[PDB]
Symmetry: C3
């Protein structure tokens, strides 16, 4: 295991591949092209701590993907990793894992086609053995599938953001990945509209640069806890969730939740009102994880 890690260290030594933009375009009323990369990219996960992350597109978690319910995805993965194969598993899709979530070799590309027939906030991740290693090293993200008939509370929502929770462990350390507590637990935000922040899973960015909102607004968060290993007790300080849709399916409706339990890979659409000006921490209420980085901020102003 650690001999392989020593070999990995030599092969990825000095490798820092600049982020490559996600490419997407609609090619039919129910067909969409998506082109992503697997690449090796240095990310500062805490001040003074660089993690040479295994990523989609040089982000960890990876870039946001948004499609409509009923879209068939024509997906291409370009593997830029000089030595490790990589793959893609979208939780949104119906696919044959052994035919459609297969490995793409270093310096090669693979193309796969599958439908997204279910609305919600789905995890995506690399599906290459050991899957734990590929996820823990940074190969995770979110795909949102917009419901054909929306959510019953759509008209009430004033502003929206995407938040993702993930853990970071000791660098490419399989023993730690399997047996150790996370070194950091973090939130990131991925842009839905021009001007939205787009950040990586780190301990600081969403504290230094809070998400922004106005007094009185109803805020929707599309959220997913990608793990790899921990569950999340999602809570926004100073408010209560008016409405919650588990995994973002409109049918899984809950009301007036203080805290939303998310399994590893679990998602939700949560909506809440901010009644007063100020800064509202966003946490996992498992406070050991909050202490290890998992606190984002929402700054609410009159204007």
């Amino acid at each position: 295991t650690q001999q392989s890690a020593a070999n990995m260290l030599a092969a990825h030594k000095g490798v820092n591949q600049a982020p490559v933009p996600l490419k997407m375009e609609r090619v039919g009323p129910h067909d969409v092209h998506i082109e992503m990369t697997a690449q090796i990219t240095d990310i500062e996960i805490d001040k003074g701590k660089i993690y040479k992350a295994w990523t989609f597109n040089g982000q960890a978690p990876g870039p946001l993907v948004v499609v409509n319910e009923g879209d068939t995805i024509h997906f291409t993965l370009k593997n830029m990793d000089p030595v490790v194969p990589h793959s893609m598993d979208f939780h949104a899709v119906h696919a044959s894992p052994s035919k459609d979530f297969i490995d793409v070799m270093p310096n090669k590309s693979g193309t796969f086609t599958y439908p997204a027939n279910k609305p919600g906030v789905f995890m995506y991740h690399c599906g290459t053995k050991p899957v734990l290693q590929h996820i823990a090293n940074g190969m995770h993200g979110v795909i949102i599938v917009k419901p054909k008939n929306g959510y019953p509370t759509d008209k009430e929502v004033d502003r929206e953001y995407v938040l993702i929770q993930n853990e970071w462990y000791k660098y490419n350390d399989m023993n730690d990945f399997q047996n150790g507590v996370p070194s950091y637990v973090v939130f990131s935000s991925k842009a839905l509209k021009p001007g939205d922040p787009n950040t990586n899973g780190d301990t600081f960015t969403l504290k230094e640069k809070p998400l922004l909102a106005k007094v009185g607004e109803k805020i929707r968060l599309y959220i997913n806890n990608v793990g790899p290993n921990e569950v999340s007790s999602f809570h926004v300080v100073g408010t209560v969730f008016d409405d919650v849709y588990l995994d973002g399916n409109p049918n899984n409706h809950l009301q007036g939740m203080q805290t939303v339990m998310l399994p590893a890979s679990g998602g939700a659409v949560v909506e809440f009102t901010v009644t007063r000006p100020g800064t509202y921490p966003i946490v996992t209420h498992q406070f050991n994880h909050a202490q290890k980085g998992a606190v984002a901020m929402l700054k609410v102003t009159e204007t």
Copy 2:
């Protein structure tokens, strides 16, 4: 961290502030005054183990607070801690955390006003940085907000109690709080009506003095797992939950659950029937935690 803990030890050495009763009174059809303390109080959490707890009112978890849906709370915190600032975060309320959940200095008081517009079983806790430290040291509790229109099963309920789950760690040890397994996991009960028990989070009291009920009764428990860190798999041995309302919101109705998953800070209203005389253990079904203290007893008699 441990130099600060050594300084903390010196400052709280010999400090054992006797419990001070919660003070509450209604001042209008939708307005209620609540007066609490932050204080340092020795609690026996296991036989032979004294924890010099950071508390509200000399109890850990703190005293029960009950209000009605739609009540505005006029809250005062009197900080009796000679050296550490403290604050209050009620999960029931809509408030500006940076204006309304702010620190109160040693030997000072602070007053804050906010509405409780949502029914349920909410965690409250100290919101002072590091929040993990303040919660782990004992600054947690429950506020119940009674629904305007009750619960659909109100008429079926024969008896009710409040139960709270919490963990205890190595004394004021931030490394342990962040990285270690809990030393003890415990239940406590807080009084709803005269004659109800009112206990602290310890490994023994609810075993030695079980909650009481009669054969055939439908029992309601208002429950919250305050953590700080663990989730709870709440189960009453020998019965099944007839009805469950997640976070105590009447809309989040489940039926016939064997076990209720609670996130850290998660609450519920659970209802079950005890059909035969005997003693019924109440557990988290995460049995490592049950073994470390988290078993309460319900003694059911013909009379």
Copy 3:
């Protein structure tokens, strides 16, 4: 603790009791006889790793029990353990734990009667102090109670299997049981119909011999995470759950879930469609546990 374990080692040394079939028969429209054993049986939980398991009937998890909603169970436990008392707790039943879930001494039998009035997928386990020790050593299983009025989606289901998740720790090590990470986390399958596999909780069997299905089929899994200690993030790779019934109660209906959060002892009925030929991994998405064994396979063929 470890002196008792040393004494236990001597007493169970060389003991390997061959599996004994479950015995069940219906004795009335709403009355069923069930006869089980407690016995000590060597199980290979990972290649080269024998665990001298404490079991019901020489299986760990124990044999599947299926009854109808409203059945009263006349249950007999025959304790074959030469030295340790054992008992039975069925989560399906209403019973007095202190009268009905009581210990049966070595080489004795006990008979208990109680109703199963609630539909669902319930854990059963030994209830002998320390309960953690008896569960961790292998005394867990599932009882299914079939709903009187079925599930609304019954007509859509093409094939069904039972899956159970459990952990294994260091052998009969109470310190590890309470404080340590699981050494292995595993799935097993228990037969519902002739020809179904029936396996023990190990890291390999459901990989080497996948569950079988046909292209296009809707599959139902009756699932329970028996722990003892961990929660489960249940996910089938390459599909989405069309319908989920929490604890197998028809009322607790969710739709379009990617992943189902199960507490320790938590169950569910989950249904999903497999659209393409291939092999579909079944995991807990807490990937440290998946890496430590918790991956089963579903092989889907045209025929």
